[PDB]
Amino acid sequence: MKYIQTDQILDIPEGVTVDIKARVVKVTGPRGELTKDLKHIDVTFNKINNRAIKITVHNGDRKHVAALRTVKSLIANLITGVTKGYKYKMRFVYAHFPINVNIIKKDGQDYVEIRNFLGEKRVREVKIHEGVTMEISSTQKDELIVSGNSLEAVSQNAADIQQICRVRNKDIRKFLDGIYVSERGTIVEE
Amino acid sequence: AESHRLYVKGKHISYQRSKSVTNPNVSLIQIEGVASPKDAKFYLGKRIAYVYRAPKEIRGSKIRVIWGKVTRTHGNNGLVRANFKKNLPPKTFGASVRIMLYPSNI
Amino acid sequence: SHRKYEAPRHGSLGFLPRKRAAKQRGRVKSFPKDVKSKPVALTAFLGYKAGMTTIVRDLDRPGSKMHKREVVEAATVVDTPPMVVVGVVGYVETPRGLRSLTTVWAEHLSEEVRRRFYKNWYKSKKKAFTKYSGKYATDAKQVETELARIKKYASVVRVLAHTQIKKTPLSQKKAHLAEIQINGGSVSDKVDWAKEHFEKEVSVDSVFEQDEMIDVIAVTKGHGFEGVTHRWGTKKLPRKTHRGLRKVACIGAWHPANVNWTVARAGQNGYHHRTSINHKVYRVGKGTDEA
Amino acid sequence: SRLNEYQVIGRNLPTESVPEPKLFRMRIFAPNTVVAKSRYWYFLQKLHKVKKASGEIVSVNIISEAKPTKVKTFGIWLRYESRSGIHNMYKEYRDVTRVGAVETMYQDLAARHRARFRSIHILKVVELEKTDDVKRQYVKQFLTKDLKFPLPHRVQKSKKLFQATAPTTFY
């Protein structure tokens, strides 16, 4: 229908300085700095004030308009990742064989190593993204904590861990063993 | 000094033609710097010379000329139709001609 | 209509055309990838196939029935007198591939490598490399200029080395001269190594260790013109076939109205360039050893 | 097409029984008076027992726009034929002239419904005086207070084939 104009308002908390230039967003906060390129989207930014930014699409069709609130959400995720952090708690689900999870370091690179999954001799190694911290919690048994500023990296490492522990040639309704993301939240609890 | 040109550069583009049949008696000329039929109408009636070199000498000269004249415009992009005394040979497609400034009407 | 019964095709399409090698010396198509961290060392050597022999060896392979049991194995001997470094070539990366930029020769070349440049040596004035040798006139600054050019611009450095064929029982007097890529170090290090080795011998002991896996580049045994039955291993026709039986009965369908390239035809057999990989070096023997 | 709005008035041919037949008027959007008089008979024969042979054209007049330089919103009622059946729609257009909005309509239904000129009957063309008369959002969005919008990504038409400078799209 080519809507004449569509707008969103990003809210910037007190300790954060969002910096936009040629659709390269840089968000700085107490927890560090994040950056994102949005060069594949035709959007324009206006600084309403120090706490509010306007995001606009002019004469955009249905899909072009749809690509606007996703931009807002991505920049908001960057904002909340440098002020509160991102924390994913994963459980170890197994029926018979305990899952042995180690945080090892080979070739100067950290890895998450899964052993004895479903009794398999194969060892599963998961590369850890930069800016992401893996931890075996003390507070609860059979736990994994994935922490980091960037939601995308944290969630993608959690997804890689979940997908590498999939069961083959079995009834997955019956063989429910695996590592599953149980809680998605922030480092600073609210 | 460094420039002595009194003519406008042109190029022999094609014969008048349909998709499959060509008419050698009419040549299409691209005049340099012309892009519209209004501009090309300045050159109607002006004389065109195709100047080429030949093996044998005639009166001590190896340069021969075929004379023509601009008759009408062609299309919308400033080409003109030229009528030469002897048809320009097909090997001159892309060769350069000289659009002389006479008969002047300025 | 389809074949009544399925069968694999005879021969490989990955070794066409089955023509004679352009040169009797096998050429190294690809060299090991260069690692700057490694020390500067050669990557290839030239020898002569002496012949085959038999060894006895205790097999060390846990889980095999022959584990810790003697095995009789065929082996091949390669006579490898040391090679002489005579030149250095620099190669520059271009959008059209590697391009040789500069070749620098040694001041002195042995006669057996100078014969390489002559089809009729006995009738020559033997003028090869005489002016080039003069180019070493008490300062060799042209040589240094070329070496500096190689250091500055080249990305691949190869060394021109020849065999000392006079040390072998062959009656041939022409040496074999080949380019051997130098790996390890920077280009400056490679050029320094090549210059410091001009007119020097390099032995196999400094190129190959024992128990290594190496590749062999060679031109196979020639057999001349050969029919399809032996060239491609096709089935012989029945005994009662008119006009002979060492043929392929159908060389194609009606359409395409042409003979396909994949149909077996008679032609030249053997004398092909072949690369064979994963040959274990059982021994590196020394000519000075009497045992 | 490029159209005009015509008044066409006609009547049955007078008879000794019926010596003063009723006069009928239609507003016709046609490119010329030859089509305008043809379209008139097309719609009378769909509504009354009359033919060109048994009827008469009384008057044909061009109706010029009352206020050609005033921006209006027109509501148009349509009856068009698809490949399958016959449908009614109501569409709205913003334009300064009543004729041009019809011209937009013909381009619009050709683009969105593959409806040719022969397939369309215009039931009514109405000026929307009030803002609450506007039903379609694709014209309601241009009636807002203090409407501004840029034209990003301007493309400049070049006369020459080769430009020595890098292109720009500012505006």
Added chain:
Amino acid sequence: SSTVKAANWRFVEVGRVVLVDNKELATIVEIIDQKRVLIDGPKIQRQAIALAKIVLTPIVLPNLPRGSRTATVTKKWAAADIDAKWAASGWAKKLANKERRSQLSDFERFQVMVLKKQRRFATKKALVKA
């Protein structure tokens, strides 16, 4: 602070000064669609045009009500002195310069070359010593 780089677009709004035919000045009095506007001016006929046939200039006529008739536009145009503002821009100067060059004859083109020679002599002399 935030420091968001904002675009410097020219807007399609009531009061924009526009070039029509690269010869005349007009102003937008009302917006019809995404593509069409209504333009009016002292030396142009009040008409509906497409935005692709005009060029928006960096000048805005302030406080021009939507749909203003010709008399109102003329009065406010005189009040804001749009012609003087337009003729002061580098754009209008470059235009008028283009026509002025277009009017030259062969004689004063020769004079232009001669004066260019003199100025180049002076400029080179000044450039070598500073």
Added chain:
Amino acid sequence: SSFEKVVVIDGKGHLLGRLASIVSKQILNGQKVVVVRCEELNISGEFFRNKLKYHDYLRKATRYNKKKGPFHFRAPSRILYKAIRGMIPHKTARGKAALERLKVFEGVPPPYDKKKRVVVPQALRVLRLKPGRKYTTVGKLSSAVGWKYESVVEKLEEKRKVQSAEYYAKKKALTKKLNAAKASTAESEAAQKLAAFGY
């Protein structure tokens, strides 16, 4: 419009087929054309779609002898050359001569690295495509279908760009001195008259 002796076209940002059609009409008319940076050309449509199109192109080969068939060149310059040759009567002597008038390169090799590069507005992707549309860079497609020299070309291009930036810094320094000298010699009798003439 002017008849240039050689036209050097910087192929960056240009749509493949539109540039090809314009260049074909140019070289058929007797104009010498050199297209550089053919690895920076663009094709409308996403990368995967164009890769599928190229794989469909690769499927075509002479059945009875693969050495006779179409020769699928993977280099970007050769892809542009194939597009252009499709638009030329190349089987005649006139077409052969017209093809002799064209050069295509990856990167900007000598001697064109120090010459003037121009663009064609009618074929520029940023001026032609709708802003939300997807496109392919011919270099990436070439790498995907077997071109071996993308890294070498980008290395040589970055070296050339360093050299060209140094040249531009020198040129910008020199022009600024001339502008200062021209301003000083303004407001003189020669300068004042040249203002009245539109110069």
Added chain:
RNA sequence: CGAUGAUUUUUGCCCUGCACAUUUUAGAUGGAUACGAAUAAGACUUUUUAGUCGCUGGACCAUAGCAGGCUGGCAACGGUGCGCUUAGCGGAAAGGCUUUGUGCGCUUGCCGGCGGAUAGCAAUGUCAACAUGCGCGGGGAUAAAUCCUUUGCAUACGACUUAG
């Protein structure tokens, strides 16, 4: 497509400064006039707010002189051509881009004096780069390949690997 070796003791060959004469042209007739990147962006000034620039190369450079002659002066110590000459950079196909000093010119930056006719009222009215040959001049070098015999790592014959 590249790198490298050797290139006829023959009056033959190579480099080079010419001079003249030729054959050819897919087609000179002032100048192919060098950032890169983005385009919902660039570049300036302050200030990161704001202002200005573009909205086409109808630009920029060059352009006056018997196809550009012979002379004189004024002014500045510049511009430009050629010839040597210094140094640096450039290997993607560098074969070019700058640079020092010097010599000879020319200079329309300004002002002069003398000459152009008759090619008859137009006739391309002949003026360019590449190549070749030949006459000189200065330099520089002084081979191989094939057949033949032989070999058998090859082979229908050619070809190939060898040796002489």
Added chain:
RNA sequence: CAUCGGUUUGGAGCGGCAGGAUAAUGGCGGAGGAAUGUGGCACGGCUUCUGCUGUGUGUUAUAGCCUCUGACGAUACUGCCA
């Protein structure tokens, strides 16, 4: 090269006349009305009230708009010019 005759293609062609709703518009004048309501007024959020701004009110005020109309005056378009 000039002029002529025949055929024909154009011009950023120029002028006169006619018709139409004796164009419709516009400009001027008068009357009435309303909102995407100007000023003002009343509440407000950031502004040293820095096109400040938003929301209410209401009818030209420090903007204006719409409808009808009265006397003029043009232009468009379509034709004609022996």
